[PDB]
Amino acid sequence: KGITEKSGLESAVCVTNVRSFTSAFLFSIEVQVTIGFGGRMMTEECPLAITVL
Amino acid sequence: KGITEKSGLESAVCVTNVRSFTSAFLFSIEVQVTIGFGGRMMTEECPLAITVL
């Protein structure tokens, strides 16, 4: 849905705005050091992600 | 882009919303004391920024 920008859909995703390993290794930074940049919320759905948090 | 007519998503620079030395200083305060203000985020476009982080 980003190859073609027509969708713009982020209603059904496990962990928003994580798209690559670079982003994952910047999100983990935002969660460990209590920075919390917050362009990447954790929606409530996938409980495995919540366990990992 | 402020001068021009079309925005073009600001072309997704190394670090969002840094326009001047004052903005960089504010961003540093945001990113160290763990304020994590969460308006001036950090993408992964350039890995040197991640190294600095």
Curated annotation (Swiss-Prot), chains A, B:
Residues spanned by motif Selectivity filter: 34-39
- UniProt intramembrane stretches: 21-32, 33-39
Summed up, the tissue specificity of this protein is: Widely expressed, including in pancreatic islets, pituitary, skeletal muscle and heart.
Name the domain of life this protein comes from.
Eukaryota
Where it sits in the cell: the answer is:
Membrane
Segments on the Extracellular face: 1-20, 40-48
**Subunit text:** Interacts with ABCC9.
Q: According to its UniProt entry, what is the function of this protein?
A: Inward rectifier potassium channels are characterized by a greater tendency to allow potassium to flow into the cell rather than out of it. Their voltage dependence is regulated by the concentration of extracellular potassium; as external potassium is raised, the voltage range of the channel opening shifts to more positive voltages. The inward rectification is mainly due to the blockage of outward current by internal magnesium. This channel is activated by internal ATP and can be blocked by external barium. Can form a sulfonyllurea-sensitive but ATP-insensitive potassium channel with ABCC9.
Give the family this protein belongs to, as stated in its UniProt record. Answer: Belongs to the inward rectifier-type potassium channel (TC 1.A.2.1) family. KCNJ8 subfamily.
Protein name as it appears in the record: ATP-sensitive inward rectifier potassium channel 8
Organism of origin: Rattus norvegicus (Rat)
- Source gene? Kcnj8
